[PDB]
Amino acid sequence: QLNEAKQQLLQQAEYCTEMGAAACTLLWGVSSSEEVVKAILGGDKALKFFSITGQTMESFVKSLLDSDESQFVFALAGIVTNVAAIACGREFLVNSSRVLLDTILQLLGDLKPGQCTKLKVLMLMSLYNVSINLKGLKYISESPGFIPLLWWLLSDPDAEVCLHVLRLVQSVVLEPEVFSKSASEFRSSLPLQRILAMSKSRNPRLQTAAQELLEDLRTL
Amino acid sequence: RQQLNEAKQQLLQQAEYCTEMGAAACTLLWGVSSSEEVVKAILGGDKALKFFSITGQTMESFVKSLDSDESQFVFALAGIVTNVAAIACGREFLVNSSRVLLDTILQLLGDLKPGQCTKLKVLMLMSLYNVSINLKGLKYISESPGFIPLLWWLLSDPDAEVCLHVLRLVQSVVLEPEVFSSSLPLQRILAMSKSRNPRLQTAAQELLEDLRT
Amino acid sequence: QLNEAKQQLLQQAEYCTEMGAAACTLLWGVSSSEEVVKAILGGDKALKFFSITGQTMESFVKSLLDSDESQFVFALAGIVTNVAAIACGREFLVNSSRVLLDTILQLLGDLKPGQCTKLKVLMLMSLYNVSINLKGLKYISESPGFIPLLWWLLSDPDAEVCLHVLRLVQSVVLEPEVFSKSASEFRSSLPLQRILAMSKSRNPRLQTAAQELLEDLRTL
Amino acid sequence: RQQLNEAKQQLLQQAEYCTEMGAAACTLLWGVSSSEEVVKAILGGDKALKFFSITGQTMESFVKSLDSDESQFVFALAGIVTNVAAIACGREFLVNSSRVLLDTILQLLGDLKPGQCTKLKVLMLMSLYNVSINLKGLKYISESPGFIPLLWWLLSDPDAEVCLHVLRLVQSVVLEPEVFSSSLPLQRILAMSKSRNPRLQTAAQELLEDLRT
Amino acid sequence: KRNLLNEFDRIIENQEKSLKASKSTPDGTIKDRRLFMHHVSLEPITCVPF
Amino acid sequence: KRNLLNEFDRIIENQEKSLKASKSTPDGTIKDRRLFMHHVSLEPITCVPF
Amino acid sequence: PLILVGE
Amino acid sequence: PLILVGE
């Protein structure tokens, strides 16, 4: 009996991730539309969706993925990103889905450098989008361990992860008011050595990102 | 047996978490699928085939069991199918590629007894009418085994909305040169021909014109 | 100094009602669109608007109106009606604006028969629309004094007010589950004498409304 | 004097309740006014004339005083004007019927010193560009007293977004055969011609082409 | 139509009796009352000013 | 245009230098950061799957 | 102010 | 699964 119970437990999970991957990929596909995002935000169904979204990403990252589960979480991370790309979407996420923003910040710290590189980029993109909203920048940069998270993520050798970290950093340093205490002290908390090292990188896009970020830092 | 009851509860907790994500994700699809551009975009993805295949599976799975999260899940699936089928390329897609889904819809319309999931029966009836706007769609449905018997058994249903959409499905078939083979409950069609719902009586009266010509 | 203070207090009110009448009439004009309603519900700005809407209707009814203030409250009542005409709008109002629904019920009881006939019709229309939503029917018909309110409103000799009361009654009696205790007892709480009297009225629309409502009552 | 301080507080409470309804109602108009059909419907009502007249009043009223409810109120008005002016019939309407509003916008762009209500200055600059797409609109603005001096004083503003939209307004005028009467801060236009905002430098470089031809 | 390459929707020979598809929404199926009964159909009401 | 009866929008003789109106939204003016600064413009990012 | 009541 | 990043 035990074996029969475990057997269809596995059978229930593979169906669930299959449905999840199919439904959410369709949603991710159409979420690039502003009108689709506005429609999604309509109702309390947005709340329940983003709630269960954070749980699934968390539940899957903790299991460390097959091409089914991985496509599922990619879609979830892609939807959040595209919602956050719309002004009212990032405004909705910081007012109504701070738990999900916390989960995203947490999960970026659980993933060791080199695992789920594409999931990190997607999550980093959503954070960047949220940081365009003024409350969103405040909540993110006030999150405990936010700056340490940047160092942790910059230890990934993948250039695309590093490009998107520097994008997030670029966003945060352009706001001096939220700066932790002294502006010069906040600069010293940033991974300057890693940024300067990347300002001499083979990757052209990453080299320019780090080099421009270096300019902003020197002129404060 | 010292690891069994715990594993059984974990089975139930997964099922709850599963239909909770299903209801949430598909209700959102249900909502945006009212747009024609969205339906096109959905069908242009590789997951479209996979989505509608498992749609019919989970639809048939649940009806063989009504809960709220589960009811919202299945309604959302039937609602998505209905809205996709309302688009020309949508019903083309379903008859070219998801006929197993169509068979399931025809099947479940027979397994539901009059009164249970009337809301689901109404959506499915709407979806069959929508794909029947498509020539291949009209052909595949009307040639389903026991299709015409099912329509009269569906007219036995006491719900006025079920009956409205059975009368529209029948009206769609009659509007095309088709095989005829006398079982018309001309009572229940005439019984509904004089009603104070001015869409039901209109659906029977307009249908009665065709049943003569 | 006193007179100067009172003078521009009056001058501030007339500007306020002028802006209110202009802005809200434009909103009432476009609120017949489903896409406009969905757009309005977008955000927390819907919440603050419907909150201040109930306050203004209440504040103006208590003052008992010139063609400015009256057009202002008509627009507010018209917007609520048209929001409630959309399924997600009536769902939003019962989940997020029960205070406004209370105000509307209260204000229908403050207006004596024959004052603000058009405001009553608009408010009655919104209640009818809300009663199409299942939670909306429950909240309305469970409101204390709801049935007495129907009697009170049916004492208005205006035929259009009475037509719209009977519309609301038609809606409520078609749901036996929410019926107060016994269905036959609930029928006895309705203004049967007034309905039967209206089933013999000169007004053709009102005569048919009462006559059809009479049929529904006899067959329970 | 035994009825004065109480009346004064009631004055303040009304003002708060007023700009609270104003911010709420006009933010909703601001949002839906992005649709072209909505702008048409708005202009087809009798209140359109009355709405835009009092728009310019309350706009000028507040700037002669920055609060949050009040800031949202005035932004919403300027945002509505901007979105109406983006529609062909909208800018036609404003130049035919609400030129006092246009004069107020031109005036307040001069009364705001560089740094206060920069967000409001940006919206108003956007609205003047939009109505200048209309021939009558271009004429009435450019012939405003002190218009060309205002543009260079607006280029003194240190904000890059203000400057972007001053350069687009100037670009709109230069794109039509017009009176010329040498005050071009070719420094600040050339100073902005080499920038790392790739829309600002592009707005000056494209403008410099026209200033030669 | 004439050539059955892409267009497979049926064409009706009578203008009055057109085929018309119906859509659905989550609210309205889930949150609304089923008001399409045998003797009446209750539907929302809308008001526009002049 | 040719006849100045209803159409008063200016026509530009160069295809490249068209007049293009800009709209605004409440969120984005009110809730977003002013990220159009002198050395960079920060704008949202969108991702579509294949 | 008059009111058109389209259902 | 590949990802197109249109800004």
Coordinates of all heavy atoms in Angstrom, one line a residue, chain A residues 68-138:
Chain A
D68 N 10.2 20.5 -17.0 CA 8.8 20.9 -16.7 C 8.8 21.9 -15.5 O 8.4 23.0 -15.7 CB 8.0 19.6 -16.4 CG 7.2 19.1 -17.6 OD1 7.3 19.8 -18.6 OD2 6.6 18.1 -17.5
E69 N 9.3 21.5 -14.4 CA 9.3 22.3 -13.2 C 10.1 23.6 -13.5 O 9.7 24.7 -13.0 CB 10.0 21.6 -12.0 CG 9.2 20.4 -11.5 CD 10.1 19.6 -10.6 OE1 11.4 19.6 -10.8 OE2 9.6 18.9 -9.7
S70 N 11.2 23.5 -14.3 CA 12.0 24.7 -14.5 C 11.3 25.7 -15.4 O 11.3 26.9 -15.2 CB 13.3 24.3 -15.2 OG 13.2 24.0 -16.6
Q71 N 10.5 25.2 -16.4 CA 9.7 26.1 -17.2 C 8.6 26.7 -16.4 O 8.2 27.9 -16.6 CB 9.2 25.3 -18.4 CG 8.6 26.2 -19.5 CD 8.7 25.5 -20.9 OE1 9.3 24.5 -21.0 NE2 7.9 26.0 -21.8
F72 N 8.1 26.0 -15.5 CA 7.0 26.5 -14.5 C 7.6 27.7 -13.8 O 6.9 28.8 -13.8 CB 6.6 25.4 -13.6 CG 5.4 25.6 -12.8 CD1 4.8 24.6 -12.0 CD2 4.7 26.8 -12.9 CE1 3.7 24.8 -11.2 CE2 3.5 27.1 -12.1 CZ 3.0 26.1 -11.3
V73 N 8.7 27.6 -13.1 CA 9.2 28.7 -12.3 C 9.7 29.8 -13.2 O 9.6 31.0 -12.8 CB 10.3 28.3 -11.3 CG1 9.9 27.1 -10.5 CG2 11.6 28.0 -12.0
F74 N 10.2 29.5 -14.4 CA 10.6 30.6 -15.3 C 9.4 31.4 -15.7 O 9.4 32.7 -15.7 CB 11.2 30.0 -16.6 CG 12.5 29.3 -16.4 CD1 13.0 28.3 -17.2 CD2 13.4 29.7 -15.4 CE1 14.2 27.7 -17.1 CE2 14.6 29.1 -15.2 CZ 15.0 28.1 -16.0
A75 N 8.2 30.8 -15.9 CA 7.0 31.5 -16.3 C 6.6 32.4 -15.1 O 6.2 33.5 -15.3 CB 5.9 30.5 -16.7
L76 N 6.6 31.8 -13.9 CA 6.2 32.6 -12.7 C 7.1 33.8 -12.6 O 6.6 35.0 -12.4 CB 6.3 31.7 -11.5 CG 5.3 30.5 -11.5 CD1 5.4 29.7 -10.2 CD2 3.9 31.0 -11.7
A77 N 8.4 33.6 -12.7 CA 9.3 34.8 -12.6 C 9.1 35.7 -13.8 O 9.3 36.9 -13.7 CB 10.8 34.3 -12.6
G78 N 8.8 35.2 -15.0 CA 8.6 36.1 -16.1 C 7.3 36.9 -16.0 O 7.3 38.1 -16.4
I79 N 6.2 36.4 -15.5 CA 5.0 37.1 -15.2 C 5.3 38.3 -14.3 O 4.9 39.4 -14.6 CB 3.9 36.2 -14.7 CG1 3.5 35.2 -15.8 CG2 2.7 37.0 -14.3 CD1 2.8 34.0 -15.3
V80 N 5.9 38.0 -13.1 CA 6.2 39.0 -12.1 C 7.0 40.1 -12.8 O 6.7 41.3 -12.6 CB 7.0 38.4 -10.9 CG1 7.4 39.5 -10.0 CG2 6.1 37.4 -10.2
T81 N 8.0 39.8 -13.6 CA 8.8 40.8 -14.3 C 8.0 41.7 -15.2 O 8.1 42.9 -15.1 CB 9.9 40.1 -15.1 OG1 10.6 39.2 -14.3 CG2 10.9 41.1 -15.7
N82 N 7.1 41.1 -15.9 CA 6.3 41.9 -16.9 C 5.2 42.7 -16.2 O 4.9 43.8 -16.7 CB 5.7 40.9 -18.0 CG 6.7 40.4 -18.9 OD1 7.8 41.0 -19.1 ND2 6.4 39.3 -19.6
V83 N 4.6 42.2 -15.2 CA 3.7 43.0 -14.3 C 4.5 44.2 -13.8 O 4.1 45.4 -13.9 CB 3.2 42.2 -13.1 CG1 2.4 43.1 -12.2 CG2 2.3 41.1 -13.6
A84 N 5.7 44.0 -13.3 CA 6.5 45.1 -12.7 C 7.0 46.1 -13.8 O 7.3 47.2 -13.4 CB 7.7 44.5 -12.0
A85 N 7.0 45.7 -15.0 CA 7.4 46.6 -16.1 C 6.3 47.7 -16.3 O 6.6 48.7 -16.9 CB 7.6 45.8 -17.4
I86 N 5.1 47.4 -15.9 CA 4.0 48.4 -16.0 C 3.9 49.2 -14.7 O 4.0 48.6 -13.7 CB 2.7 47.8 -16.4 CG1 2.8 46.8 -17.5 CG2 1.6 48.8 -16.8 CD1 3.3 47.4 -18.8
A87 N 3.8 50.5 -14.9 CA 3.8 51.4 -13.7 C 2.8 51.0 -12.6 O 3.2 50.9 -11.4 CB 3.6 52.9 -14.1
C88 N 1.6 50.7 -13.0 CA 0.6 50.3 -12.1 C 0.9 48.8 -11.6 O 0.4 48.5 -10.5 CB -0.8 50.3 -12.7 SG -1.0 49.4 -14.2
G89 N 1.6 48.1 -12.3 CA 2.0 46.7 -11.9 C 3.0 46.7 -10.8 O 2.9 46.1 -9.7
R90 N 4.1 47.5 -10.9 CA 5.1 47.7 -9.9 C 4.5 48.4 -8.7 O 4.8 48.0 -7.5 CB 6.3 48.4 -10.4 CG 6.0 49.8 -10.9 CD 7.3 50.4 -11.6 NE 7.3 50.0 -13.0 CZ 7.2 50.8 -14.0 NH1 7.1 52.1 -13.9 NH2 7.3 50.3 -15.2
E91 N 3.5 49.3 -8.9 CA 2.8 49.9 -7.8 C 1.9 48.9 -7.0 O 1.8 48.9 -5.8 CB 2.0 51.1 -8.3 CG 1.0 51.6 -7.3 CD 1.6 52.4 -6.2 OE1 2.8 52.7 -6.2 OE2 0.8 52.8 -5.2
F92 N 1.3 48.0 -7.8 CA 0.5 47.0 -7.1 C 1.4 46.0 -6.3 O 1.0 45.6 -5.3 CB -0.3 46.2 -8.2 CG -1.0 45.0 -7.6 CD1 -2.3 45.1 -7.2 CD2 -0.4 43.7 -7.6 CE1 -3.0 44.0 -6.7 CE2 -1.1 42.7 -7.1 CZ -2.4 42.8 -6.6
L93 N 2.5 45.7 -6.8 CA 3.4 44.6 -6.2 C 3.9 45.2 -4.9 O 4.0 44.4 -3.9 CB 4.5 44.2 -7.1 CG 4.1 43.3 -8.3 CD1 5.2 43.1 -9.3 CD2 3.7 41.9 -7.8
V94 N 4.3 46.4 -4.8 CA 4.8 47.0 -3.5 C 3.7 47.3 -2.5 O 4.0 47.3 -1.3 CB 5.7 48.2 -3.8 CG1 6.7 48.0 -4.9 CG2 4.8 49.4 -4.2
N95 N 2.5 47.5 -3.0 CA 1.4 47.8 -2.1 C 0.7 46.5 -1.6 O 0.2 46.5 -0.5 CB 0.4 48.7 -2.7 CG 0.9 50.2 -2.7 OD1 1.8 50.6 -2.0 ND2 0.2 51.0 -3.6
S96 N 0.7 45.5 -2.4 CA -0.1 44.3 -2.2 C 0.6 43.0 -2.2 O 0.0 42.0 -1.8 CB -1.3 44.2 -3.2 OG -2.1 45.4 -3.2
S97 N 1.9 43.0 -2.6 CA 2.6 41.7 -2.7 C 4.0 41.8 -2.1 O 5.0 41.3 -2.7 CB 2.6 41.2 -4.1 OG 1.3 40.8 -4.5
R98 N 4.2 42.5 -1.0 CA 5.5 42.6 -0.4 C 6.0 41.2 0.1 O 7.2 41.0 0.1 CB 5.5 43.5 0.8 CG 5.6 45.0 0.4 CD 5.6 45.9 1.5 NE 4.3 46.6 1.7 CZ 3.3 46.2 2.5 NH1 3.5 45.2 3.3 NH2 2.2 46.9 2.6
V99 N 5.1 40.3 0.4 CA 5.5 38.9 0.7 C 6.3 38.3 -0.5 O 7.3 37.6 -0.3 CB 4.3 38.1 1.2 CG1 4.8 36.6 1.3 CG2 3.7 38.6 2.4
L100 N 5.7 38.5 -1.7 CA 6.4 37.9 -2.9 C 7.7 38.6 -3.1 O 8.7 37.9 -3.5 CB 5.5 38.1 -4.1 CG 6.0 37.8 -5.5 CD1 6.5 36.4 -5.6 CD2 5.0 38.1 -6.5
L101 N 7.8 39.9 -2.9 CA 9.1 40.6 -3.1 C 10.1 40.0 -2.1 O 11.3 39.9 -2.4 CB 8.9 42.1 -2.9 CG 8.0 42.8 -3.8 CD1 7.9 44.3 -3.5 CD2 8.4 42.6 -5.3
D102 N 9.6 39.7 -0.8 CA 10.5 39.1 0.1 C 11.0 37.8 -0.4 O 12.2 37.5 -0.3 CB 9.8 39.0 1.5 CG 9.5 40.3 2.1 OD1 10.3 41.3 1.9 OD2 8.5 40.4 2.9
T103 N 10.1 36.9 -0.8 CA 10.4 35.6 -1.3 C 11.5 35.7 -2.4 O 12.5 35.0 -2.5 CB 9.2 34.9 -1.9 OG1 8.3 34.6 -0.8 CG2 9.6 33.6 -2.5
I104 N 11.3 36.7 -3.4 CA 12.2 36.8 -4.5 C 13.6 37.2 -3.9 O 14.6 36.6 -4.4 CB 11.7 37.9 -5.5 CG1 10.5 37.3 -6.2 CG2 12.8 38.3 -6.4 CD1 9.9 38.4 -7.1
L105 N 13.7 38.1 -3.0 CA 14.9 38.4 -2.3 C 15.5 37.2 -1.6 O 16.7 37.0 -1.7 CB 14.7 39.6 -1.4 CG 14.6 41.0 -2.1 CD1 14.0 42.0 -1.1 CD2 15.9 41.5 -2.6
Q106 N 14.7 36.5 -0.9 CA 15.2 35.3 -0.2 C 15.8 34.3 -1.2 O 16.9 33.8 -1.0 CB 14.1 34.7 0.6 CG 14.5 33.4 1.3 CD 13.3 32.5 1.7 OE1 12.2 33.0 1.9 NE2 13.5 31.2 1.7
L107 N 15.0 34.0 -2.2 CA 15.4 33.0 -3.2 C 16.7 33.3 -3.9 O 17.5 32.4 -4.3 CB 14.3 32.7 -4.2 CG 13.0 32.1 -3.5 CD1 12.1 31.6 -4.6 CD2 13.4 30.9 -2.6
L108 N 16.9 34.6 -4.2 CA 18.2 35.0 -4.8 C 19.4 34.6 -3.9 O 20.5 34.4 -4.4 CB 18.2 36.5 -5.1 CG 17.4 36.9 -6.3 CD1 17.1 38.4 -6.3 CD2 18.2 36.5 -7.6
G109 N 19.2 34.6 -2.6 CA 20.2 34.2 -1.7 C 20.4 32.7 -1.5 O 21.5 32.3 -1.1
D110 N 19.3 31.9 -1.8 CA 19.4 30.5 -1.6 C 20.2 29.9 -2.8 O 20.9 28.8 -2.6 CB 18.0 29.9 -1.5 CG 17.2 30.5 -0.4 OD1 17.7 31.4 0.2 OD2 16.1 29.9 -0.1
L111 N 20.1 30.4 -4.0 CA 20.7 29.9 -5.2 C 22.2 30.1 -5.2 O 22.6 31.3 -5.3 CB 20.0 30.4 -6.4 CG 18.5 30.2 -6.6 CD1 18.0 31.0 -7.8 CD2 18.2 28.7 -6.8
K112 N 22.9 29.0 -5.1 CA 24.4 29.1 -5.2 C 24.8 29.6 -6.5 O 24.1 29.5 -7.5 CB 25.0 27.8 -4.9 CG 24.6 27.1 -3.6 CD 25.1 25.6 -3.6 CE 24.5 24.9 -2.4 NZ 25.0 25.3 -1.1
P113 N 26.0 30.3 -6.6 CA 26.5 30.8 -7.9 C 26.6 29.7 -8.9 O 27.3 28.7 -8.7 CB 27.8 31.4 -7.6 CG 28.2 30.8 -6.3 CD 26.9 30.6 -5.5
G114 N 25.8 29.8 -10.0 CA 25.8 28.8 -11.1 C 24.6 27.9 -11.2 O 24.5 27.1 -12.1
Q115 N 23.7 27.9 -10.2 CA 22.5 27.1 -10.3 C 21.3 28.0 -10.6 O 21.1 29.1 -10.0 CB 22.2 26.3 -9.0 CG 22.0 27.1 -7.7 CD 21.7 26.2 -6.5 OE1 21.9 26.6 -5.4 NE2 21.4 25.0 -6.8
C116 N 20.5 27.6 -11.6 CA 19.3 28.4 -12.1 C 19.7 29.8 -12.5 O 19.1 30.8 -12.1 CB 18.3 28.4 -11.0 SG 17.8 26.7 -10.5
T117 N 20.7 29.9 -13.4 CA 21.2 31.2 -13.9 C 20.1 32.0 -14.5 O 19.9 33.2 -14.3 CB 22.3 31.0 -14.9 OG1 23.5 30.6 -14.1 CG2 22.6 32.2 -15.7
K118 N 19.2 31.3 -15.3 CA 18.1 32.0 -15.9 C 17.0 32.4 -15.0 O 16.4 33.5 -15.1 CB 17.5 31.2 -17.1 CG 18.1 31.5 -18.4 CD 18.0 33.0 -18.8 CE 18.5 33.3 -20.2 NZ 18.4 34.7 -20.5
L119 N 16.8 31.7 -13.9 CA 15.8 32.1 -12.9 C 16.3 33.3 -12.2 O 15.5 34.2 -11.8 CB 15.5 30.9 -11.9 CG 14.6 31.2 -10.8 CD1 13.3 31.8 -11.3 CD2 14.4 30.0 -9.9
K120 N 17.6 33.4 -11.9 CA 18.2 34.6 -11.2 C 18.0 35.8 -12.1 O 17.6 36.9 -11.5 CB 19.7 34.3 -10.9 CG 20.0 33.2 -10.0 CD 21.5 33.2 -9.8 CE 22.0 32.1 -8.9 NZ 23.4 32.2 -8.6
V121 N 18.3 35.7 -13.4 CA 18.1 36.9 -14.3 C 16.7 37.4 -14.2 O 16.5 38.6 -14.1 CB 18.6 36.5 -15.7 CG1 18.3 37.7 -16.6 CG2 20.1 36.2 -15.7
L122 N 15.7 36.5 -14.4 CA 14.3 36.9 -14.4 C 14.0 37.6 -13.0 O 13.4 38.6 -13.0 CB 13.5 35.6 -14.6 CG 13.6 35.0 -16.0 CD1 12.8 33.7 -16.1 CD2 13.1 36.0 -17.0
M123 N 14.4 37.0 -11.9 CA 14.1 37.6 -10.6 C 14.8 38.9 -10.5 O 14.3 39.9 -9.9 CB 14.5 36.6 -9.5 CG 13.6 35.4 -9.4 SD 13.9 34.3 -7.9 CE 15.8 33.9 -8.2
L124 N 16.1 39.0 -11.0 CA 16.8 40.3 -10.9 C 16.1 41.3 -11.8 O 16.1 42.5 -11.5 CB 18.2 40.1 -11.4 CG 19.2 39.6 -10.3 CD1 20.5 39.2 -10.9 CD2 19.3 40.6 -9.2
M125 N 15.5 40.9 -12.9 CA 14.8 41.8 -13.8 C 13.5 42.4 -13.1 O 13.3 43.6 -13.2 CB 14.3 41.2 -15.0 CG 15.4 41.1 -16.1 SD 14.9 39.9 -17.5 CE 16.4 40.2 -18.7
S126 N 12.8 41.6 -12.4 CA 11.6 42.0 -11.6 C 12.0 43.0 -10.5 O 11.4 44.1 -10.4 CB 10.9 40.9 -11.0 OG 11.7 40.2 -10.1
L127 N 13.1 42.7 -9.8 CA 13.6 43.7 -8.8 C 14.0 45.0 -9.4 O 13.6 46.1 -8.9 CB 14.8 43.1 -8.1 CG 14.5 41.9 -7.1 CD1 15.7 41.6 -6.3 CD2 13.3 42.2 -6.2
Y128 N 14.7 45.0 -10.5 CA 15.0 46.2 -11.2 C 13.7 47.0 -11.6 O 13.6 48.2 -11.3 CB 15.8 45.9 -12.5 CG 16.0 47.1 -13.4 CD1 17.0 48.0 -13.2 CD2 15.0 47.4 -14.4 CE1 17.2 49.1 -14.0 CE2 15.2 48.5 -15.2 CZ 16.3 49.3 -15.0 OH 16.4 50.4 -15.8
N129 N 12.7 46.3 -12.2 CA 11.5 47.0 -12.5 C 10.8 47.6 -11.3 O 10.3 48.7 -11.3 CB 10.5 46.0 -13.2 CG 10.9 45.8 -14.7 OD1 11.6 46.5 -15.3 ND2 10.5 44.6 -15.2
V130 N 10.7 46.8 -10.2 CA 10.1 47.3 -9.0 C 10.9 48.5 -8.4 O 10.3 49.4 -7.9 CB 10.0 46.1 -7.9 CG1 9.6 46.7 -6.6 CG2 9.1 45.0 -8.4
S131 N 12.2 48.5 -8.6 CA 13.0 49.6 -8.1 C 12.7 50.9 -8.9 O 13.2 52.0 -8.4 CB 14.5 49.3 -8.1 OG 15.0 49.6 -9.4
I132 N 12.0 50.9 -10.0 CA 11.6 52.1 -10.7 C 10.5 52.8 -9.9 O 10.5 54.1 -9.8 CB 11.2 51.8 -12.1 CG1 12.4 51.3 -12.9 CG2 10.6 53.1 -12.8 CD1 12.1 51.0 -14.3
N133 N 9.6 52.1 -9.3 CA 8.6 52.6 -8.4 C 9.3 53.2 -7.1 O 10.3 52.5 -6.6 CB 7.6 51.6 -8.0 CG 6.6 52.1 -6.9 OD1 7.0 52.0 -5.7 ND2 5.4 52.5 -7.3
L134 N 8.9 54.3 -6.6 CA 9.6 55.0 -5.5 C 9.5 54.2 -4.2 O 10.5 54.0 -3.5 CB 9.2 56.4 -5.4 CG 10.0 57.3 -4.4 CD1 11.5 57.1 -4.7 CD2 9.5 58.7 -4.5
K135 N 8.3 53.8 -3.9 CA 8.1 52.9 -2.7 C 8.8 51.6 -3.0 O 9.3 51.0 -2.0 CB 6.6 52.6 -2.5 CG 5.9 53.7 -1.6 CD 4.4 53.4 -1.6 CE 3.8 53.6 -3.0 NZ 2.3 53.8 -2.8
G136 N 8.9 51.1 -4.2 CA 9.6 49.9 -4.5 C 11.1 49.9 -4.2 O 11.7 49.0 -3.7
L137 N 11.7 51.1 -4.6 CA 13.1 51.3 -4.3 C 13.3 51.3 -2.8 O 14.3 50.7 -2.3 CB 13.6 52.5 -5.0 CG 15.0 53.0 -4.5 CD1 16.0 52.1 -5.1 CD2 15.2 54.4 -4.9
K138 N 12.5 52.0 -2.1 CA 12.6 52.1 -0.6 C 12.6 50.7 0.0 O 13.4 50.3 0.8 CB 11.6 53.0 -0.1 CG 11.9 53.6 1.3 CD 10.7 53.8 2.1 CE 11.0 54.3 3.5 NZ 9.8 54.3 4.4

